[PDB]
Design a binder for this molecule. Sequence first.
Ligand SMILES: Nc1ccn([C@H]2CC[C@@H](COP(=O)(O)OP(=O)(O)OP(=O)(O)O)O2)c(=O)n1
Ligand SMILES: [Zn+2]
Length: 461
Amino acid sequence: GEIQWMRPSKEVGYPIINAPSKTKLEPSAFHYVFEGVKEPAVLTKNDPRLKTDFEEAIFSKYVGNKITEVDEYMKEAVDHYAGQLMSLDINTEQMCLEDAMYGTDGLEALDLSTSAGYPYVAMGKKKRDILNKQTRDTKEMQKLLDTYGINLPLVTYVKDELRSKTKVEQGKSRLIEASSLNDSVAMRMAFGNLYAAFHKNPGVITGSAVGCDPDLFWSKIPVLMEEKLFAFDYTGYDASLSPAWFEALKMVLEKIGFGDRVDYIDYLNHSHHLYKNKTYCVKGGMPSGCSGTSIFNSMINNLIIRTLLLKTYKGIDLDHLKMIAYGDDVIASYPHEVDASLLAQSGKDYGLTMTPADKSATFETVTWENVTFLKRFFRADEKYPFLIHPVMPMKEIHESIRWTKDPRNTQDHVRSLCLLAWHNGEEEYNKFLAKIRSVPIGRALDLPEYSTLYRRWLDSF
RNA sequence: CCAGGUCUCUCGUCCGG
RNA sequence: GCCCGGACGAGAGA
Ligand SMILES: Nc1ccn([C@H]2CC[C@@H](COP(=O)(O)OP(=O)(O)OP(=O)(O)O)O2)c(=O)n1
Ligand SMILES: [Zn+2]
């Protein structure tokens, strides 16, 4: 990805849009019961915690475009992945406007509680003003599509969220791109049966984990993997995707029968953004807040890894690759060990920055003991070895519990953390409950005992 | 008073068959 | 008891 031009939105006849400037995050009843490093990310330039220049920092990610041509390995990658998806029998038809808006089997409705994006946001117009879940009325949306069309600019916000200390000082706040409601609707009309097919088929055929529930999927994963795992992390995945990767996507889409709407992918490539008082253009890269990004990012990941394998190990048999991606996250396997330091070397040639999994300083054998996906580890149940726990380390749960957006959410919030926590085992969980109960508000909370959660987990199989 | 994307999963409240 | 569905809220993950 790479910026092409900034300029006051006035010169282009675009509205100024004002984001809020204060975080909604605030210390919890538990802020001092537990230790933690993270704090709310920089939202504005005038932030005392800044050790650098903000806007320079947040737009830094657009690292450039390495390649544009689909090379021979990419082509092979495309053919293999596409042929895989072909076995699912994906419905290639446009989705009617009603299902695109209101959801169908495998596709949730548009989120009524989020922004409707440009131009609606500058007209003080909301999704609730346009959509009606009970009647599923399409008349008003249809009119708006006719009136304003598609391919509208995105609106740019900084995400309000917790960030490590170094990310705060260095102004590394993540940016969000708010899709227009017209575009979300158009993208779902085009690609909705694709999204649903993916959501219904998490596993190694789609090469995607979208639609999975870790409490249950964790037990499937090791059975689906080949004998030898490998994994790594990307630095700046989306912003480092060069145009060649998107053509490769379009080629996969053409192959499985979406050829007639691959023009939508070109739109995701040449995008305009409104940020505060400015307007810019990006070339390449896929905006995160666009519809389908989850599916498309996972798809490209499937392409990237096949490509790197074909380049790095001549004569590799891709039929023996088993991988599951969730966007840039990935757990992968092959019947013989593959060296991710070698994969990362080849990655450089396609613009990709690949580093050791889970922030190791060096590349090391990935084992069932140290491998993580969706931030969770894998640990066999002591009593039932074939049942695997997704184990999210207490560290993250402690960071989360220390903050709140609204103290009215305390019960919901802590209870959700419990469902993540208990997988660390009865002893760590009980220690967790004691801490919570060490302050009065914690004693007002109804929290599940270990044995309840465990029986619930066993039952759910 | 509001404001701040796309998705998945889960829990909770309430309401149904 | 068990099943299923809906509206809203929240949490985590990508
Ligand atoms: N709020 C978010 C967070 C993540 N993602 C998607 C986009 C990128 C991908 C990977 O996200 P992370 O690896 O968790 O963050 P990052 O983009 O690499 O930023 P950082 O390196 O600072 O964590 O997931 C997203 O769509 N929306
Ligand atoms: Zn442009």
